[PDB]
Amino acid sequence: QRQLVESGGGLVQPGGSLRLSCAASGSILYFNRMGWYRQAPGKQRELVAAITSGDSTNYADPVKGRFTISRDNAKNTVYLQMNSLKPEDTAVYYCNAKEKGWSFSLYDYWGQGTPVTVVKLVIWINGDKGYNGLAEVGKKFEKDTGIKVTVEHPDKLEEKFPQVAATGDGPDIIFWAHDRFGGYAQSGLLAEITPDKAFQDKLYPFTWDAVRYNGKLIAYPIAVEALSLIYNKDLLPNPPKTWEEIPALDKELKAKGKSALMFNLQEPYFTWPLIAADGNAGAKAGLTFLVDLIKNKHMNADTDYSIAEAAFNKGETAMTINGPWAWSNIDTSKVNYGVTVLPTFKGQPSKPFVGVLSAGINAASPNKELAKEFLENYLLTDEGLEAVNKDKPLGAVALKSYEEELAKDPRIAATMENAQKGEIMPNIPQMSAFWYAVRTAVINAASGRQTVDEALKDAQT
Numbered sequence: 001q002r003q004l005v006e007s008g009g010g011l012v013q014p015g016g017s018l019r020l021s022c023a024a025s026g027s028i029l030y031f032n033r034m035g036w037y038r039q040a041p042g043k044q045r046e047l048v049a050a051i052t053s054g055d056s057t058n059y060a061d062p063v064k065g066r067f068t069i070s071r072d073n074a075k076n077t078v079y080l081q082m083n084s085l086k087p088e089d090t091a092v093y094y095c096n097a098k099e100k101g102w103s104f105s106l107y108d109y110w111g112q113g114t115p116v117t118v119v120k121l122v123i124w125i126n127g128d129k130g131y132n133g134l135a136e137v138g139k140k141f142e143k144d145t146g147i148k149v150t151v152e153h154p155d156k157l158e159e160k161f162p163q164v165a166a167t168g169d170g171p172d173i174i175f176w177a178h179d180r181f182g183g184y185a186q187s188g189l190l191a192e193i194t195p196d197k198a199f200q201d202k203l204y205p206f207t208w209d210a211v212r213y214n215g216k217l218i219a220y221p222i223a224v225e226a227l228s229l230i231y232n233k234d235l236l237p238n239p240p241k242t243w244e245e246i247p248a249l250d251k252e253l254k255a256k257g258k259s260a261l262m263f264n265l266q267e268p269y270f271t272w273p274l275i276a277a278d279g280n281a282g283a284k285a286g287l288t289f290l291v292d293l294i295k296n297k298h299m300n301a302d303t304d305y306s307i308a309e310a311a312f313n314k315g316e317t318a319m320t321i322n323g324p325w326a327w328s329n330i331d332t333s334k335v336n337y338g339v340t341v342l343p344t345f346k347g348q349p350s351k352p353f354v355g356v357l358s359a360g361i362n363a364a365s366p367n368k369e370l371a372k373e374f375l376e377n378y379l380l381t382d383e384g385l386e387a388v389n390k391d392k393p394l395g396a397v398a399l400k401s402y403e404e405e406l407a408k409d410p411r412i413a414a415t416m417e418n419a420q421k422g423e424i425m426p427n428i429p430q431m432s433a434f435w436y437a438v439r440t441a442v443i444n445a446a447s448g449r450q451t452v453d454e455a456l457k458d459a460q461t
C-alpha cells in the first residue's frame with residue numbers, strides 16, 4: 001500500500017522559513033495531483049498549494065508569492081518551501097495525492113500531518129522606560145526557548161491598548177502603571193494572573209495589592225515609581241525645600257541666563273503633587289500658584305517632557321521633576337545632578353501619586369502560558385530586572401532580593417521619601433476619565449482660557 005509521511009514541522013519567527021517534505025511509498029509518477037492542505041485549530045480545510053502531473057502549480061491568495069511547491073521524482077517527495085512566514089500561516093499542514101487507476105475511478109491519499117507554529121512574543125511598554133534592556137531579556141528568552149521577543153513603544157499606548165486589544169490582536173503583554181489596569185480589568189481586556197506560591201513570595205505583599213481588582217490578580221508588579229526633585233548641584237547646591245521660594249530663585253537665575261524649574265506641565269501626573277500638597281481649597285491654592293508661575297513668565301506655557309528634559313540635561317534649568325527612568329539620560333550628559341524631596345507648599349508636603357509599573361497579559365492572546373514564563377522565570381528575576389534597570393532605572397523594584405542594592409542608592413532613598421509623602425493610585429475604572437479631567441483643567445488654566453475656580457467646577461462633574 002501507498003503511504004504519505006510529512007516532515008519539517010516546527011516553531012519559527014514571523015519572517016523566517018520552513019521546508020515541509022512529504023515522502024511516499026511509491027512512485028510520484030503514478031499520482032495525478034499532489035498538494036498541501038492546512039487546518040488551524042477550529043477551522044475548515046484550506047488548500048495552500050498543488051502540483052499536477054503536467055507540472056502546473058496553483059496556490060491560494062494568502063500564500064501566493066511567499067510559498068513554492070516543488071517536486072522530486074527521484075526522492076519520491078513533494079516539498080513546500082515556506083518563506084516570509086506570518087502568524088496567520090500557523091496550522092497543521094497535511095499532504096495529499098490523487099491517483100487515477102487503470103479504470104475511470106480515482107484514489108485520494110492523505111498523511112499524518114505536520115504542525116507549523118509561527119509565534120512572536122510582542123511587548124508594549126512606554127518609550128520613557130528601558131525597552132532596550134527589556135529586549136536583552138527577550139533575546140535571552142529566544143536563546144533558551146526559540147520564541148522571538150519584539151519590544152514596542154507606541155505613542156498614547158495607555159489609550160491605544162484598549163482600542164486595539166479589544167478589536168485587533170494588539171500585544172501579548174502590556175506594561176503601564178497599575179492605575180490604568182482596573183479599566184482594562186472591568187472591560188475584560190486582561191487575563192487573570194495565576195502565579196504559584198513560590199513566585200508570589202519573591203515580591204513584596206504590598207505590591208501584589210496594587211495589581212488586584214475585585215479579588216483577582218490582573219498583572220505582575222515590576223517596580224514602585226514616584227516623582228522627585230532632580231537638581232543641578234553646580235547651579236544650585238542648597239535647593240529649595242519650599243515651592244514659595246522658587247520665584248525668588250528664578251529671578252536670581254534668569255539674571256544669569258538660566259531657569260529655576262522646568263518640568264512637564266502638559267501631563268497632569270507632574271503637576272498633581274503641587275496641586276494635592278494642602279488637599280477643594282487645597283487644589284485651588286495649589287493650582288493658583290502654578291498659574292502665577294506662568295503668569296509671572298517663570299515657566300513657559302507649553303512646557304512638555306522633551307523641552308524640560310533637554311533643558312535640564314543641557315544645563316539651561318537648575319531643577320526638574322521626573323521619575324527613576326529619567327536618571328540614565330542625565331548620567332549620559334555631563335551634569336552633576338541630585339535627586340531630593342519635592343518642595344513643600346503652604347508648609348505641608350507635595351503629595352505625588354505613586355505608580356506601580358505592572359505587566360498584564362492581554363485576554364485576546366494565544367501566547368498566555370509563554371508570556372507567564374517570560375514574565376516569571378526571565379523578567380521578574382535578579383538578572384532580568386538588572387538588564388532593564390541598567391538601561392533606564394525601574395525605581396524601587398518589587399523584587400525582595402533587590403532591597404540591599406536599592407538601599408545603597410541615594411536617589412532611590414529620595415524616591416521612597418516622596419512616595420511616603422504621596423499615595424498609591426486607586427486602580428478603579430474611573431481613573432481614565434479623572435486623568436482626562438485633570439489634564440484638560442491644567443492646560444486650560446496654564447494657557448489662559450478657563451479660571452482656576454471654573455477648572456475645578458468642570459473637573460468635579
Ligand SMILES: OC[C@H]1O[C@H](O[C@H]2[C@H](O)[C@@H](O)[C@@H](O)O[C@@H]2CO)[C@H](O)[C@@H](O)[C@@H]1O
Nearest residue numbers: 126128177179180225267268269355435
Ligand atoms: O499624566 C497622567 C498620567 O500619569 C501617569 O502616567 C505616568 C506613568 O505612570 C509613568 O510611569 C510615566 O510613564 O509617566 C506617565 C506620565 O507621563 C498615570 O499612570 C496615567 O494613568 C496618567 O494618564
